[PDB]
Amino acid sequence: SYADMLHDKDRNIKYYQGIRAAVSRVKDRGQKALVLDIGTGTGLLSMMAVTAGADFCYAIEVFKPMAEAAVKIVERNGFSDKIKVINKHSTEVTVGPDGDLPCRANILITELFDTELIGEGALPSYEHAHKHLVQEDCEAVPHRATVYAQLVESRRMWSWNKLFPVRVRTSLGEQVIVPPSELERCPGAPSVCDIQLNQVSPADFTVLSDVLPMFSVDFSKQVSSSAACHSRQFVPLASGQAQVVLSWWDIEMDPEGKIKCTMAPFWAQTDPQELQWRDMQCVYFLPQEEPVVQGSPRCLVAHHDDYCVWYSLQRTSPQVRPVCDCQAHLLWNRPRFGEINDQDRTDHYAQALRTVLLPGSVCLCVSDGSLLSMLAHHLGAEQVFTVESSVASYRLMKRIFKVNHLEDKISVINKRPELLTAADLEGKKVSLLLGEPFFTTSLLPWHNLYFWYVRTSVDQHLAPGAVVMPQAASLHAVIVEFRDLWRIRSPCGDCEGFDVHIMDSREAEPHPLWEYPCRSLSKPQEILTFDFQQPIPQQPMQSKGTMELTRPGKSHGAVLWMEYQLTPDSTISTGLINDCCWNPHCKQAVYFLSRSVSYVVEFHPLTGDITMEFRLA
Ligand SMILES: Nc1ncnc2c1ncn2[C@@H]1O[C@H](CSCCCCNCc2cccc(-c3ccc(Cl)cc3)c2)[C@@H](O)[C@H]1O
Ligand SMILES: [Zn+2]
């Protein structure tokens, strides 16, 4: 997490300018400059405050390992005389004879901000600090933040929050899978969706409002963690369906507002060429979509408690954070909603099924919260068994079956799919085991090989000449140059003249690369192939190999992903779709390196784990 904090020169330079100005304001009134730095991490901002002329710094860090690093970094840079590191939560910190501080500080520095601004406890930390740790009449860096909101319509972003009608073409015309009405009514998951709006095509949404300033936090004055709401009257820039609130904040480092960072996306700033990349923006969903009309004014309401923000449109006439009362939002993350609502993807799976559905086939469907079972039945399966391994998921799938009048056409088995019995299949044999494959708990692409393990575990229940779908799957890699993402894992070593070197097999990281532009240096190479049609070989699959770097640029990482061979005539990619183009529904794995790259990759059968190394050569 704290590798990103150092690579952000714009953040560091602005904190440094704020700290110089805030220490000078205090020294110039003839006063002792006493710094309280809540969330010191490395101590960088405490080291800045001393170079600026602060008399002492009290640097608070709750995470022991970081506290201990901060102690060593302060010593190496020569600041131990003027910086005391305290390993506690700021709310446990006291002023007194047996206290952490001898007296209240008069310069308050923090970096307790996430994408939502208040999600890392800034409101309660600042509250406790003004109450107990800081003088009235005190400098704060940052001085003030402001949260902005922009109302939009976005089929694509609304497809992260709602189940749409799903179409399949049967022999006897086109069929429609409709969503349970309670989904349509749900406010959705009571949590922010944090995205790089800079990578959203301006075609994917229509702006309905100006950028509205919704509220400000003044860090120099007493701050409340109390629930509040802020209403802004606005004039719709156009007519359409109010669906999504795009949000971001800016900070001012000084009382005059001269020193400023903003998280604003490209289209809300004056010059795209002056943009400074961040490791971003918020996407919220209105609890109901509703039409707005050009010229015809409405009131957008920002709500917040001590950690959470949420949005409503005030009724024309005319508060707990609403929660999911439909189940779906607790089982399906935003990407998964988007994935299920991709009609081209459903069409591609439909055509795969028309192929491998021999007359009177007996389908077992394996994949969490999957619509394949409904497609299978609509396309002429004799009988459909499906596995849902949680009660919540069992109940949601039964609910979707019921409202589509298929409650007696599809059997849900509520077990771990590998532990399935002959009686769960009503003594019938499976002619067609099928899946996406998708499982809720899969973090890396190959975790979905759990499908293959299940296929192995249930061999004895498969009819002779049983077809599997996917029939096979392959691990693919490509070496890439990242526009920006390298900074997430690239040691700083020197940070504004301060030495943080003490801060600066390898597990591949999952990342939604549709949000992180990059270009291919190698050609894409198939690394391992998995034959689902057969059991898992109980001996590890290895594969040494070479990838020739054919266009120039810093070889930043190997991007790994799955492809699934559905039928012989049909394949689908969770990685490259044809700057690299990435399937926006799945996370790809990145191996960070640290005229050719060489690899050892090994798949382990007892686990599904894959160990790998990528060395330049
Ligand atoms: N109350 C606490 N007391 C003591 N330690 C405490 C307390 N809370 C927390 N921590 C510690 O503070 C430390 C920090 S937390 C927060 C985790 C990192 C979040 N940045 C990531 C990020 C994303 C997006 C934007 C920005 C950004 C951009 C510009 C500007 Cl100008 C300012 C910020 C930053 C950790 O080391 C915690 O362990
Ligand atoms: Zn819900």
Numbering used by the authors: 34 to 312, 315 to 353, 361 to 546, 558 to 631, 638 to 653, 666 to 688
Paper passage:
Protein arginine methyltransferases (PRMTs) methylate arginine residues in histone and non-histone proteins in a mono, and symmetric or asymmetric dimethyl manner. PRMT7 is a monomethyl arginine methyltransferase that has a role in muscle physiology and stem cell biology. PRMT7, a member of the PRMT family, has been functionally implicated in a wide range of cellular processes including DNA damage signaling, imprinting, and regulation of pluripotency. PRMT enzymes display methylation preference for RGG/RG motifs enriched at protein–protein interfaces, whereas PRMT7 has been reported to target RXR motifs in arginine and lysine-rich regions.
To provide further insight into the mechanism of action of SGC8158, we solved the crystal structure of full-length MmPRMT7 in complex with SGC8158 refined to 2.4 Å resolution (referred to here as MmPRMT7_SGC8158). The structure showed that SGC8158, interacted only with the catalytically active N-terminal methyltransferase domain of PRMT7 in MmPRMT7_SGC8158. Clear electron density was observed for the ribosyl and biphenylmethylamine moieties of SGC8158. The biphenylmethylamine moiety of SGC8158 extends toward the conserved THW loop region (residues Arg311 to Met315) and displaces the Trp314 side chain, to occupy a hydrophobic pocket composed of Trp282, Phe146, Tyr48, Met296, Arg44, and Arg311 side chains, and forms an edge-to-face π-stacking interaction with Trp282. The PRMT-conserved THW loop is part of the active-site pocket and involved in substrate binding, but interestingly SGC8158 did not affect the peptide substrate binding. Comparison of the THW loop region in MmPRMT7 with all other PRMTs showed that this loop has a variable length and conformation, suggesting that it likely has a role in the selectivity of SGC8158 for PRMT7. SGC8158 is a structural derivative of SAM, acts as a SAM-competitive inhibitor of PRMT7, and occupies the adenosine pocket in the SAM-binding site of PRMT7. Additional optimization of the methylene linker length between the terminal amine moiety of SGC0911 and the adenosine core structure resulted in SGC8158, a potent PRMT7 inhibitor (IC50 < 2.5 nM), which showed good selectivity over a panel of 35 methyltransferases including PRMTs and kinases.
